[model samples]
Target chain A: TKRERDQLYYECYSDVSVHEEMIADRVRTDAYRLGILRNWAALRGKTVLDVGAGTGILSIFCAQAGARRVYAVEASAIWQQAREVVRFNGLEDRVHVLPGPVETVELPEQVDAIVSEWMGYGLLHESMLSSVLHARTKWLKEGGLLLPASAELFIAPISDQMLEWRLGFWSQVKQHYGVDMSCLEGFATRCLMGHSEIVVQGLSGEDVLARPQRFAQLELSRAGLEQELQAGVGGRFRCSCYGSAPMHGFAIWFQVTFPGGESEKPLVLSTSPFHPATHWKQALLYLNEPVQVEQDTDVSGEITLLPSRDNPRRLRVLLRYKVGDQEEKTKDFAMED
Target chain B: DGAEREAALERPRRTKRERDQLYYECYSDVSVHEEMIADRVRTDAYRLGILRNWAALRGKTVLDVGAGTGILSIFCAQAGARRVYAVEASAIWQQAREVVRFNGLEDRVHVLPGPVETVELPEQVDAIVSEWMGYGLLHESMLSSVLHARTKWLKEGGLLLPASAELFIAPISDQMLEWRLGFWSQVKQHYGVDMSCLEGFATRCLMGHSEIVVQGLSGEDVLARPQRFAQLELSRAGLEQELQAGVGGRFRCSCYGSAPMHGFAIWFQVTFPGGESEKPLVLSTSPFHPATHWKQALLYLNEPVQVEQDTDVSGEITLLPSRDNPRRLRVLLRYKVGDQEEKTKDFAMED
Candidate 1:
């Protein structure tokens, strides 16, 4: 059934990128709407650059922030329009809008910071982070601010739209397929959320085990503290996604700043259905392991964010988990960069 | 191809729908975000306090774009902007005007219930104020609206609250990449008959990416100068970035912090020719900030990863307003890393 099976595989994810940008757009707008502005006073009069500068918002901000000159870099389908916006805003002289991917795009000068809105789905979806990381090795100045002064991943228990989604999938299988696919129902019976607790801290990808089987710690800020996600306990669960659980939604939070922590507020915005919807919906998590578990049992695991293989400009996470005595590790999974 | 074309032709095309339906679907709510800015972990709101004091904005004409709730306009009024035009695009704009009336800033703060893109200006204003930055700073293309306003309404030397914006990033090992991209990896490694290096090859697919790096793969054969504009294959070319162990992880939140961090919040300070500067207001994560009526944006990783200062990501990012998709923008960036005490460089991404 490799051909038929391969067909099934593509069917499951051929459409994953369909909503990638839609989700990315929501995340970007929510990032700004939530007031994640970072202050870069030193960037004033100093050369500055932005990778994946979508609409010249950050570039415009840099100019206003008094950067000597701001270079805006973008690699998606919006290069021309970015130029037009620069001209439209009459920022032709102050802000330079360049097109193409960061990997190949070259800049003229060394800069203070390479700021971007690249984080997605727990900090890497569009894969913009890869280009940014590459761009960093080649462009940024020493000791420049990383606009996101610090970031954290937040998790709680809830159940909403996803509650009905899993239920409907089984219904479709039984009615349309007309097969005993019903046996598979035992694996996903409303226990998705109970098995996973989100590690709401900023951990890079490639660090956790395959599928978050254990709770992990993420960096919320440069200042260290306590009240963590939890100890890395062994647990196990199987599911296609995490939020499908009927208990709570996942919430990721971050605090962004400029050269220092002067220009941003506590950039706290909850994307769960539990909160009002913003452009950025709660970041969706689809786990490969789909199994049933004890109610309220903590199958939560450590989290990480990092570069991706399929995407060049995004980041991914490792949902490290330990199902009982089995210390299983999940490989890096992708998201926005 | 023929079969697909027939199938395509057979399907009907949807007619024009409300942008609100589309936009609102994306920007679901805004108030929730405003409250977050007002939380305890938010000290970023007050950082630019003295810098953007009321003295800066006192007695000047102001035009605000996408003036969700018009709270900023009221701040303008209080800061003594002689006339403030607060424009909001959502259906909620009407309610904003009512609030303006209630605050007795109806004259001082004019709440217009239309998108700035289509709205005509009565006269040139001293400055334009807007909280339109989105993820990657272009997710909603609000800049086009604001820039449109800037061209038609702003005075020369007018100021943008956030005169500058940029993106940040770092490298790390994320398990989510394994699940997402690795889900397929599992199929090939576990199910494929090639139990050889396919496991190693499949595992390479787990690194999180920054952008889709394919279009720039054009290269030329050389022991000579490479020809420009040659077609190059980008079939799974990995970008040259070190994705170590501290970048991607699930987000764990904290409500307590004094340095003003924990979640993403936005704040801005602008300039205008006046006796005083307006106080920097909490635009993103403050309860003091007006709500956008959209849901809060979130970043969810597939797994928990540790992300520290792998590198000080410093450089430039570009935002393009692409005409191809009015709703989307073309983007790219140039960055460099600082020497961190850790193994890899240190950097981060922001909206």
Candidate 2:
């Protein structure tokens, strides 16, 4: 079943629409371009490995940055087209396209650097970090570079008008259409949350009621990273409200940092509410009941994230919090495709 | 040992939420409801064309099948229906009930939240109304449920809204087809990536070998007059099997002038009987008329054919429910241009 799921997952990448969406995210693509090109000294005449290289864009980027050789390993059927793209770009000699999961594919030698766009929704949903770690252990040389040297996950309490409108729709339906449909609000909420009980949406900085707190960080080059991730990550935070508002829910986002060579500073790709939007946007976790908070009130909570036991590609998020001496509550959320 | 091995090989069962996720999620979205309600051509057709027929609906007990948001049932109550049953399978029924109560029509409008085929009715109704048409009039297979309701409930001579429907096809030239088909080549120039090898894949994605292309087409895109290829008389329907077996009709259209024929576009129109002393009202999605949400379904050819003035394009078009998903449709098109050899293409109507 896992193989079947993997096959279906890879098959979805064969569709150009997904690639088009990723490529259209200028914020995402430009970050990778600058991250790769700015570290030319470390890559010039060096060997690099691009894991899960859909469309071989990253491999091509490494080649453009003067890498002596770049292995573009991809498991999806799109690899056939990726090969064509590599040749068409006149980088066939420098960028080698391998058509299989990195775990099964053989490489000529260990590489000096590894690159991948492995982050997914909430930084871990459908993540390829474990695979990247495997590649690092088997093929990456000591002191080898990781394009995204580190990544941090963050959470912040927010007052989302859209969530209010969605929840308030039931009451207003009567006003608009002469219906008393407030009884169905519970059902509507269940549907809105989906089976996973998480909503992925775009939000602005103004929607945030408090400062975002970093809960977890992943160092790609760290040893035993895979085992550490398996155990899950968590943190406790106390956010002071900026103003009196209804704390509708909490928002989660991630920022990845690319290590630059001696000449340049590290490039950070942030999917924060304050940053330019990307396809990932931000994941919102709505509370069953909105908590009213006054200016300077503290909203404290502990958040934990773990891979679903049934499907590692999915994520299970747990939250426990209270608003300024109020009764504490706990909620569990899952992320499913 | 054999039983244990068999049990080990079995796959996990999917939860009910996973099973109905797609269908329920589709109707639950507010934007989808807004799109349908905003299509004035569609909503007004039912309001003014069918519901306005006092002789058929006035003081009659009506059943609104698939009563999404209960708008149709509300319309029926407003039109003087004695009692209206709004049967909806999705969770929207709760809101629909609220809508009815807010309108102060709850006494007469009963919001029944369940599939029409399974929901119990107190008695046979005097009339039945449903906006059951999907793309090309049959993609969602919703009409079968309406027909079932008709057999189980409606009075002997009860009325059915949009009494009859017809599907039509015509030759057309779509400029976007050229751009879509050549997108891979353009990628070579834009991204410096020769994804030209994906041209076939792109064709399958955009203009699929099995899926129909649903989009708005202009009158200028029409190269020849359309021909009615199939008809469904809801009031005189026999059985759902007839629809499942499929429907086909031949059409020959003469080109108005010399033009490139890129593909064939299909559309449908539904007609509602008028009140006493009034003419029938028709709601058409034809390119010649104002567009509706259904739009037009286009089936492109592998290569564009150049036809001169008066050149006849004859073909037989057959529509059948897909074997895999009955909600989807499979279309078979067989045609010939002038003295050219006949060509056949298969397509599906799906999301």
Candidate 3:
């Protein structure tokens, strides 16, 4: 059944429309381009492995950066199109497109470096990093480089007007449609919460009610990383409010660091509300009831993220938090089935 | 064995979520409500033509089925109804109650928050009003609930708003059919990847090879005069079995001129019977009429067929509720152009 689910997942990638959206996301595309091209010394004359290489764009980038051999591994039906893209770029000789999951695909030799754009919503929603980890243990040589050497998950209190607007629709029904449907607000909240706890939406810095705090830092190059991630990735955070506002919910984002070569500074690709938005955007965890906070108020919270037992690609999020002197509250959320 | 027991317990919860998630989420969307309210043809037909008729609504007991925002109930109240029961199954019923109270008609308009079939009412009503038609008139199958309400709660001679409906189908020459199917070639040119391998998949996904496609079609696109395939008299249309067993009729349309017939477009027109003084009103979602939210449902052919002037396109269409999900419909189409091979194909109408 998991295999069937996975087959469906890969089948979705076969649609060029899906690839088009990913490629059209300039923030996400340019980051990988700049990250790879800037780390030329590390990739130069090296044998590289690109896992989940959709369209072979990153493999072409690695080849462009003077990699002697780049293995572009893609488990989706898009692999055939990826090979075509690789050849069209005139890097087919250097970029070999492998049409199988990295876990099972055969490679000529261990790679000097491994690269993948494996981050999903909230950094781990899709749990793709596990596949990259599998590739690392199997094919990466000793001291091999990981394109994104580390990733950090951050959370902050936010006063989102959109959340208010969505919930406030009940109260405003009379104003627009000559009917007052405000009694549905509580039911609407439950329905919204019931569908999925985490909502992936774009938010700006203005929406943040407090300074963000890093809740977890994942070192992809570290040993036992897979085990650590499977156990869970989380920590406590205390964000001080910039001004008084009703804290509607918390927003989570992530930033991955590309380890630069000996001569260059490492590059950071962020999905922070303060930075240019990416396709991943930011994940929102709405509170059942908004918490009022004053300037300098501290919103302290502990967030835990774990893979769902039924579907590893789905996530289970547990949050415990308090605002000002308010009683602490705990809420559990799960990704959509 | 312990794990197996745990899984068995988990199964029902998952099943319940899957069933309710789509149905409830669909109605909770304000945009969906907004679109329905914005369709003046649909809204005015209920408000001005049906509800405002004093002979029909004045001092009458009304039942508003699937009352999302309770607007119809409010209208009935405004039209001098003595009492109106607004039954809604979705979470929107909470707002509908608020709406009833906000309008100062809480005394007369009761918002019953549950499926009409299950919810109890104090008494049978004099009339039942509902905006329950879906694309091609039966896609969402909300009419089944209204039919249930009619049988269980309505007075013997009670009025049913939009008392009857008719489904029509006509051959159409839509350029979009070719454009959507031919898109894989454009993908190859733009991306330097020969996605021609997915042409069949694209056809299946984009065109209505297996699924119905809903879009706005201009009258100029119609290749022939539309034929009414089925007529449903809502008051007398039996319960679930009558609908589940399916509805079908034969249609024959003559082409206006030589053209490429890409697909058959289906639309519906519902009629509200006139009261003592007012004339009967019709709300049509035909390509010949201004487009409404329903648009037109298209069943695109795998390949276009050429037709000569006055070529006759004849077919039998049977629309049945899918066995797995009653809300979804499976359409069986048997059709042929002049002197061509008659072909049979099935398509699904689903979310």
Candidate 4:
């Protein structure tokens, strides 16, 4: 019931900024391009379903890779442009633009494979995954391949100087303007920290105080709405700090591998700080108050993520953390449901 | 411009009101409002200018046209206006009411949520204040609405917040063009993919028929001192002429040296007629000044052309509104490099 209502929300309107950012992300687009180009063997003469096919770019890619037919399923008004793009590429004959949800839209037949760039911030921040998972269960033929066969979530303790700089700007403004604007300090912090998730420019590897740890991995072919509704991923992390400094916050990103059939090398798209930057960037959740850290400090935290019960698309995160011998405290974070 | 004409050919049939509603919803989106409000240069200039004119504003009734978030209305009230009619066409009026109440100006600031043209104000006001400038001044077609408000509610001798504005244009040597073209070559050389076929689309995207804001351009890139081709006297400009008439603008810019002329840049500077003791405040969206959110609009040429010192590039520009969709604009340019044949093209600039 909740799924159907959320689907209606997607059908109504679209955030143009989201699409703009998506097309601007080279790493994200290049990974999908390489993945499709590398696996022409599996796609040649096969039918494909491109879930959430924004602008139908991925569907166009499938057509270029020799897909016999592609079902470009989109639920927003952007499907209007996607149709034009399909027409512009002269692939309208091969690409069918289905401007509705997979739950309701009728398909002529089951597809051979499903390809989608479905990950959002924190890998599960949006309803794209839920839709992808639903389409796979509903329409994919038995043994049909999922382009991104697997995805793993990783986290690392990071010292973001930019965060430090952003927070410091308020006080600096106060100092320069001779205005007592400190009254808005706490409110501004909460607003900035608790607003929507961050899509940052890439971070520096040197600022990372710990090795990356994989907290969760999902096989796209097997994952479902249930796993996405409430998944708890947590681990104790030891910071191999270089010197005494503040631990700004945790940097989280995901890596997805597009596995092909035998005789093809898998295409790996990583959003890790060490890797090339993607439009998704890294989701930075800074501490309400920076914590002082020293060399070899043990920073422990448990990260729990779940879709808001009322709103299937918005995500709520509960983080519990402590710094060596300090009291364990929790901060609740969420994107508007 | 040809890209705009191409999209115009398939222009969706809509009633005038439907087109108006689409235009309303476009600005209603919070991101657009946020960008406008976040622009400190734009906001601070208006606030400071209004405050400086407190003598004229004090106990004066004011009308704020298209007052998104009631900011200009609240500013008017803060400047000690007797009454403020804040007319808005967007959904943000909901938040504007709360903000007005929050500031304890609810009694003075009346948030009227509807098109300024349709909103019934209590009486004529002493001043008509608005931040109605869009990309290149007329891109969003809000100027006509502001003009309508002026004609309807403004008192004789009523002051316009930005009494006058001038549109300026000059050729620029953009480093961004080189970077963008270099990226295509890199993709081909390294990826072994001839993504160069996408260049046509990329060129259209960069040379947006609908002007887009591009950051990082500096004053050094400008080939010559900018020339103002159009001076808009907001208080007296004929609304009928604005709607149906075509404005012809001509400009000729001299090159400082032999530089690649990537595109021409356009920006506007709005001036507030100052109060008794203060100089007029000018909010300029010029590369020579600190950047504002209303960035300069760049009209990219087909490709860069190198011109020698003392060489002149001259152009004629036309601004026309779509008869079908008043919010859509048609921009035509006829220009030539020194000793070259004139090239002409039309671009669609839309809301």
**Top DockQ: which candidate number?**
2
TM-score sort, best first: 2, 3, 4, 1
Error of 1 at A254 (Å): 6.9
Candidate 2: misplaced stretches above 4 Å?
A159-187, A244-247, A289-294, A324-326, B1-41, B88-102, B111-123, B170-197, B213-227, B237-241, B252-265, B276-281, B284-314, B335-341
DockQ of each model against the real complex? 0.01, 0.23, 0.16, 0.07
lDDT of each: 0.44, 0.83, 0.83, 0.74
Per-candidate TM equals: 0.34, 0.85, 0.81, 0.61
lDDT of 4 by residue, A65-157 (tens): 899999999887768767876775578899999987776788899999999988877777775677787888889999997888888888777
The interface RMSD for candidate 1 is 26.7
| TM-score of model 3 vs. true structure | 0.81
lDDT of 4 by residue, B180-259 (tens): 65454344354333334444444545553344344446898898878887777777657448545765589997888978
lDDT per residue for candidate 2 within B157-221, as digits (tens), equals: 88888788999999998877766666667654554445666667666665555568788898988
- lDDT (10s digit) by residue, model 3, range A1-337: 8889788878877766566557657777777877888888888999999999987878887887889999999999889878876776677789999998899999999999998999988899878999999999999999998898889999999988776676676676566545566766666566554344688889989999987899999988787998988888997999789997778889999999988777577889999999997888898888886677789998897999998887888878889998888889888888654
Q: Relative to the unseen true structure, what is the C-alpha lDDT of residue A5 in candidate 3, on a scale of 0 to 100?
A: 76
TM-score of 1: 0.34
Q: Give the share of true interchain contacts found in each model.
A: 0.00, 0.36, 0.22, 0.00
Clashes (N, CA, C under 3 Å) per candidate: 262, 6, 4, 2
Question: How would you class the docking of model 1?
Answer: incorrect
Q: Which ten residues in a row have the lowest lDDT in candidate 2 chain B?
A: B12-21
lDDT of 1 by residue, B1-351 (tens): 998987785534222135434664443243332332233222133224312645556777888787665556666676667898888777657546755775567778887766686676688887676666554334555655666677777777666554433232222222233344334223223322111222232232222223222110111100111111111111112211211111121111222212211112111222222225343343332123333322122221222232232223233333444333434434433323233221221112322
Ranking by DockQ: 2, 3, 4, 1
Candidate 3's DockQ is: 0.16
Query: Model 1 scores what on Cα lDDT?
Result: 0.44
